[PDB]
């Protein structure tokens, strides 16, 4: 294994950023 293991770590980091933006906008929406 090499960058593949990092791709899954990368995947959750990006996926959580998608969820943090929605959580942030949910409380700060218009």
PDB file of C-alpha atoms in Angstrom:
ATOM      1  CA  UNK A   1       0.000   0.000   0.000  1.00  0.00           C
ATOM      2  CA  UNK A   2       0.978   3.673  -0.527  1.00  0.00           C
ATOM      3  CA  UNK A   3      -1.200   6.738  -1.501  1.00  0.00           C
ATOM      4  CA  UNK A   4      -4.278   4.402  -1.476  1.00  0.00           C
ATOM      5  CA  UNK A   5      -4.345   4.316   2.368  1.00  0.00           C
ATOM      6  CA  UNK A   6      -4.030   8.153   2.300  1.00  0.00           C
ATOM      7  CA  UNK A   7      -6.958   8.369  -0.233  1.00  0.00           C
ATOM      8  CA  UNK A   8      -9.365   6.900   2.396  1.00  0.00           C
ATOM      9  CA  UNK A   9      -7.998   9.303   5.089  1.00  0.00           C
ATOM     10  CA  UNK A  10      -8.318  12.080   2.424  1.00  0.00           C
ATOM     11  CA  UNK A  11     -11.887  10.869   1.608  1.00  0.00           C
ATOM     12  CA  UNK A  12     -13.235  11.223   5.195  1.00  0.00           C
ATOM     13  CA  UNK A  13     -11.456  14.616   5.673  1.00  0.00           C
ATOM     14  CA  UNK A  14     -13.156  15.969   2.497  1.00  0.00           C
ATOM     15  CA  UNK A  15     -16.470  14.176   3.350  1.00  0.00           C
ATOM     16  CA  UNK A  16     -16.454  15.701   6.885  1.00  0.00           C
ATOM     17  CA  UNK A  17     -15.738  19.149   5.343  1.00  0.00           C
ATOM     18  CA  UNK A  18     -18.929  18.657   3.228  1.00  0.00           C
ATOM     19  CA  UNK A  19     -20.857  17.902   6.475  1.00  0.00           C
ATOM     20  CA  UNK A  20     -19.183  20.789   8.441  1.00  0.00           C
ATOM     21  CA  UNK A  21     -20.187  23.331   5.701  1.00  0.00           C
ATOM     22  CA  UNK A  22     -23.852  22.124   5.798  1.00  0.00           C
ATOM     23  CA  UNK A  23     -23.763  22.236   9.660  1.00  0.00           C
ATOM     24  CA  UNK A  24     -22.228  25.758   9.553  1.00  0.00           C
ATOM     25  CA  UNK A  25     -24.766  27.008   6.938  1.00  0.00           C
ATOM     26  CA  UNK A  26     -27.698  25.289   8.783  1.00  0.00           C
ATOM     27  CA  UNK A  27     -27.150  27.653  11.774  1.00  0.00           C
ATOM     28  CA  UNK A  28     -26.036  30.580   9.493  1.00  0.00           C
ATOM     29  CA  UNK A  29     -28.571  30.378   6.598  1.00  0.00           C
ATOM     30  CA  UNK A  30     -30.888  33.003   4.988  1.00  0.00           C
TER      31      UNK A  30
END
